[PDB]
Amino acid sequence: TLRAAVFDLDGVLALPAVFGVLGRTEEALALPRGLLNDAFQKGGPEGATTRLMKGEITLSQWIPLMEENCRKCSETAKVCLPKNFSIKEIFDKAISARKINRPMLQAALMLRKKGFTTAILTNTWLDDRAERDGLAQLMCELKMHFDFLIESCQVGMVKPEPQIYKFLLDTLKASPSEVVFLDDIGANLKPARDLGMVTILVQDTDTALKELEKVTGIQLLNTPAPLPTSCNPSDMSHGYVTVKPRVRLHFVELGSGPAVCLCHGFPESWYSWRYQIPALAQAGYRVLAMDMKGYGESSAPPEIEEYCMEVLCKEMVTFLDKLGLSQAVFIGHDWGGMLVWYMALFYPERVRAVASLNTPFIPANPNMSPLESIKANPVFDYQLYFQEPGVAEAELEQNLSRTFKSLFRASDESVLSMHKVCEAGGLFVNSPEEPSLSRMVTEEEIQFYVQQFKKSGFRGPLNWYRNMERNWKWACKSLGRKILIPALMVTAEKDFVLVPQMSQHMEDWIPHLKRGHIEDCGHWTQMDKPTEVNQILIKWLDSDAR
Amino acid sequence: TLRAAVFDLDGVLALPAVFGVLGRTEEALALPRGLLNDAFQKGGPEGATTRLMKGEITLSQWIPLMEENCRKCSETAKVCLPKNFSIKEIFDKAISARKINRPMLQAALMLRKKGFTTAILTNTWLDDRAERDGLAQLMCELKMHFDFLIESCQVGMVKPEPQIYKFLLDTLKASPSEVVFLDDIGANLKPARDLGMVTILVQDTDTALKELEKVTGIQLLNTPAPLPTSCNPSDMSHGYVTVKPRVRLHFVELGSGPAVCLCHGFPESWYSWRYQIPALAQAGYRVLAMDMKGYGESSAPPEIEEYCMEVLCKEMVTFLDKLGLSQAVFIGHDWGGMLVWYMALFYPERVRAVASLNTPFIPANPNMSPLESIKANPVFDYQLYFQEPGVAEAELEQNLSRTFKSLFRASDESVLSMHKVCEAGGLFVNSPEEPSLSRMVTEEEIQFYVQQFKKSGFRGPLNWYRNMERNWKWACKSLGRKILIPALMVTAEKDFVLVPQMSQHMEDWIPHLKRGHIEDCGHWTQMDKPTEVNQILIKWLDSDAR
Ligand SMILES: Oc1cnn(-c2cccc(C(F)(F)F)c2)c1
Ligand SMILES: Oc1cnn(-c2cccc(C(F)(F)F)c2)c1
Ligand SMILES: [Mg+2]
Ligand SMILES: [Mg+2]
């Protein structure tokens, strides 16, 4: 029966409420009880406050009207306001105090996940204060989670006027009985109740959620911790930079603040960062999530040498030149991990900070061919298998769904050992035709990768593994250097190829290296443990890259 | 005969030279003459300095080696270094002191403009200091102006070694006698002179340029002031954001720092900002130069109401939501000008600062139909002509080259009065078939517009003029407000449609409005007076938006 949920902003989705600041100020200052609320509400439907909420005047225009009101209310109560009494001050402080009420947001999210239409209906104002950015940020963060945001000051109507509820119903394309409406002000609930909408008077959050759960029959309280926000590909800004005549690089871009370039591994996609992109933008960064050369909407030339580290890095430098970025933070995973270490070694002036997930920095051994080094470790055998052009391409392209479904698996779900792959004759020779879905990925998500890999297949991606000698020779030029810029190494306990112990000597080359470690996390770090990745990157960014 | 010019960075393209800082420090500190230069050069081809310049070690690794050298040189000279003597300190200060030598850059630019291949050949280092960003910025700014940048530390060779000159020749694809090489160090010139390259020992810049002029036969000194840097479309990062199902917006994006959204007029393009884009990025901003709805690579739906201000503005808000920008500075020209004023009035929380070129803010007259208001001013008659769907489309699409060539003209070059356009039967009825090229635009530039307008023609663009009533009604909701965020109005003396006097009452609505004014500047402000536009926007940005 219920198909829609509507939330207020002040006192419901955001706390503490700004009305509450009138009460507290009166109390803090020993003013007559309700003096500030009287001034705020003075003139009722014709007063300054309503014209503000209807969008007739702006917040900065309203400020000295409320001031006048405060003076008038205090003369008639026969009291004085303190020296320095400041409405601007009181509201600045109240508006920055007010934060997203996380359990209300997460209930709204859950309800939208079971198919509810969700809306924010709020009485609010045109905010032109020097400090307005703080509220623009809150509204941005909230509104991406809802179907509609309806603001008194944009539509020229205010709760409790009945026309705004009709406007609400009309926006929702729902009858009143399909709707639950939550509000902290009972007078604002009444007209909803008059049309026969379910209403909830929100005082403390848990009681409101308990009522909300009973009436929708969905569990909202005590629910397990949800995944971070993911990205919908078609809601992203897509960017394209030609770094040389046959090579354009695609990236997805979100956020403002210091530039942070995310570099995925094999055989992946910008979309492998789908969990870190909103979180890092939300944390104050400008995220650029690449399709690395060979992938997705980036160019994929056929030639092996187009994918040696040297060329790849020079191209990332050019990519920063064309965007006008003198630096970026470089964060990589797997092959992208190896690439960001090389960026730090050969272009430290361009790298604000470098971080790698799973991929350690191991200096080239000048006394041993890279092929032999790879032959010394049974678990890198899959790399020898990748050498012969065409062999791995045919297996990996043969059935794309089965490919990503077989590869993208948590540590306790694996269907393919990386063990004697050449000898067995391939990666999947002993894996099912139709693997089950990993807990880490939905069917929709696999199909995004499948569709990405239909453009260029696996030639470009596999080429990354076909410059062992060339990369070794280039790496050997850097053997006297150290990495002395800010650097984070994140190891993954259950990555059985890029094992944590392979990073154990990194302090010899990177003396001030910082670390994170993620337990029960396989090779596909970002999607396996997205919450922990986010927490470790954002903490390191704020302390070291900012 | 000469086909190439090669410049050094230190002492030639950038001043003062960092070597010079050794000399000055010795002098400032009363050290033995040449003590710091001895320490810097200690060990010659095997010393710390060469390994730095060859890329073997990084700058931060070199610092305590130079320190050791300074200690050793001072014991053998039988003196002590001052308490607090700091090599890091001396080099930090020297490297930030060093600036682009503007007349050398402008000579290099001029030479490249007459078809020279230009290169920077420099002995330099891998810079991993906390402060390295300053040098990354210098190198970015310089290198976009040259064909090649060759850095000792990237190629593993140093001046004066002869192999780097062979590497130079090979990169240039030129014989030695087709090359002039400028350097401030005579020893570095010698091997160039040995191959028979023309060399110039650069002491003061003007003498070096005088020699450079004599030997190339091109005028380099006393040359008129050049245009700001323009943009090559295919060197830009191109961005695309879907703001709703049939509407994606394209923009070009350069720079980092506060976001600055540029909004062009009718019938224009992101490329109308080609002169402001590098300059504003260079000044510390993140430029987003739009194709407004109806133009270029942005979508162009047919329906009139898709182009009313309300819809257009809401879409710009969504564009910021999808990019994750809580605000941007909005700068507009002509129709884009009108749009940014409406953004400031209806979404001040999203607008960091607002500026308009030519377009004044005039509040809607609630007592007069907008059509009548337009009929009251002979010079807006072209707007009535634009009303009837299809009429203006047919004239403007009939011959695109002639269209932009007729429209894009400086004030003393005009070929069409905006005078009684309806009565005459069109905009061009009394203009030539093949107009001459305006001084403001090259044939190549006109052809960029022609090609942009081949995708959707003039329906979407003209639609901007077809919501007089709808825009008026929406504007009337804002008549009690004031614009109280930071705001700049730039008037253009010889715009005979958007005349400076039409802005004269703006302080009534925008009490703290700032102003610029550009003399001898027609309607096409950005390309007519690009240098003055840049100076007025960047000054206002730095003082009001930052
Ligand atoms: O512990 C584990 C499970 N899978 N991996 C793995 C690591 C790197 C690449 C690849 C491959 F190339 F197969 F994609 C697989 C490591
Ligand atoms: O002083 C001058 C010369 N041209 N304009 C002008 C202004 C706005 C639009 C247009 C048009 F629509 F024609 F593009 C022309 C003003
Ligand atoms: Mg409330
Ligand atoms: Mg020099």
From Swiss-Prot, chains A, B:
SUPFAM superfamilies: alpha/beta-Hydrolases, HAD-like. Its EC number is 3.3.2.10, 3.1.3.76. Its cofactor is Mg(2+). It is an enzyme of class 3 (hydrolase). Residues 1-223 are annotated as: Phosphatase. It comes from the Eukaryota. Residues 258-530 form the AB hydrolase-1 domain. Mg(2+) binds at residues 8, 10, 184. Inhibited by 1-(1-acetylpiperidin-4-yl)-3-(4-(trifl uoromethoxy)phenyl)urea (TPAU), 1-cyclohexyl-3-dodecylurea (CDU), 12-(3-adamantan-1-yl-ureido)-dodecanoic acid (AUDA), 1-((3S, 5S, 7S)-adamantan-1-yl)-3-(5-(2-(2-ethoxyethoxy) ethoxy)pentyl)urea (AEPU), N-adamantyl-N[']-cyclohexyl urea (ACU), 4-(((1S, 4S)-4-(3-((3S, 5S, 7S)-adamantan-1-yl) ureido)cyclohexyl)oxy)benzoic acid (c-AUCB), 4-(((1R, 4R)-4-(3-((3S, 5S, 7S)-adamantan-1-yl)ureido)cyclohexyl)oxy)benzoic acid (t-AUCB), 4-(((1R, 4R)-4-(3-(4(trifluoromethoxy)phenyl)ureido)cyclohexyl)oxy)benzoic acid (t-TAUCB) and to a lesser extent by 8-(3-((3S, 5S, 7S)-adamantan-1-yl)ureido) octanoic acid (AUOA). GO terms for molecular function: 10-hydroxy-9-(phosphonooxy)octadecanoate phosphatase activity; epoxide hydrolase activity; lipid phosphatase activity; lysophosphatidic acid phosphatase activity; magnesium ion binding; phosphatase activity; protein homodimerization activity; toxic substance binding. Induction: By compounds that cause peroxisome proliferation such as clofibrate, tiadenol and fenofibrate. The modification N6-acetyllysine is found at residues 42, 190, 214. It is found in: Cytoplasm; Peroxisome. The N-terminal domain has phosphatase activity. The C-terminal domain has epoxide hydrolase activity. Bifunctional enzyme. The C-terminal domain has epoxide hydrolase activity and acts on epoxides (alkene oxides, oxiranes) and arene oxides. Plays a role in xenobiotic metabolism by degrading potentially toxic epoxides. Also determines steady-state levels of physiological mediators. Bifunctional enzyme. The N-terminal domain has lipid phosphatase activity, with the highest activity towards threo-9,10-phosphonooxy-hydroxy-octadecanoic acid, followed by erythro-9,10-phosphonooxy-hydroxy-octadecanoic acid, 12-phosphonooxy-octadec-9Z-enoic acid and 12-phosphonooxy-octadec-9E-enoic acid. Has phosphatase activity toward lyso-glycerophospholipids with also some lower activity toward lysolipids of sphingolipid and isoprenoid phosphates. This is Bifunctional epoxide hydrolase 2. It comes from Homo sapiens (Human).
